[PDB]
Amino acid sequence: CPQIIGRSEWTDVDAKSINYLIIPIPYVIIHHTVTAECNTRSECIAQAENIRSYHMDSNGWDDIGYSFLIGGDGNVYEGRGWNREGAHTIGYNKKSVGIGFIGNFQEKAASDKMLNAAHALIHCGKSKGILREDIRVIGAKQVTATMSPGSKLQKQIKNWLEWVPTP
């Protein structure tokens, strides 16, 4: 397991109550945030806080929409976390965790430290029993009308055995 940065470590604004997922979980959805990349803990904290602010104040959501974020610092940031319904993937918010890579990966690749953090998080989740042993990893674009997680990151996740060509 990676050492996850808890939600209260990056924001002081409380989430509203969110309904609970059934565990173990069958899907992981890979997203990109479309924000700028971040390369240090201070930078990635700021990005997480500003996505949360936009989601809660502008979209009116109960919390940042993602389950977790991956920073270019190589760290995992807890959003809604392992146990709560998402606001990341319409049709899958009750049966997945949604992992947002911080950046725009349409034209550029995600760094090795980001991919390793995300894959270690998926392995951790399986090991602990939070994710099903037969977890299906998919890019958002495979199940919703979106360019997320970006064409380049979409290619990169195909290197994981857990990735499936259909949901």
Coordinates of C-alpha atoms in Angstrom, one line a residue, residues 70 99 101 114-124 126 137 159-162:
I70 CA -2.9 11.0 -8.5
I99 CA -9.1 7.8 -10.0
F101 CA -4.7 11.8 -12.7
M114 CA 2.0 8.7 -11.4
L115 CA 1.3 5.4 -13.1
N116 CA 3.1 3.5 -10.4
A117 CA 1.2 5.2 -7.6
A118 CA -2.1 4.4 -9.3
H119 CA -1.2 0.8 -10.0
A120 CA 0.1 0.4 -6.4
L121 CA -3.2 1.8 -5.1
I122 CA -5.2 -0.7 -7.2
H123 CA -2.9 -3.6 -5.9
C124 CA -3.4 -2.3 -2.3
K126 CA -7.2 -5.8 -4.1
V137 CA -10.0 -1.3 -14.8
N159 CA -0.2 -2.2 -19.9
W160 CA -2.0 -3.4 -16.7
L161 CA -3.5 -6.9 -16.7
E162 CA -6.5 -5.5 -14.9

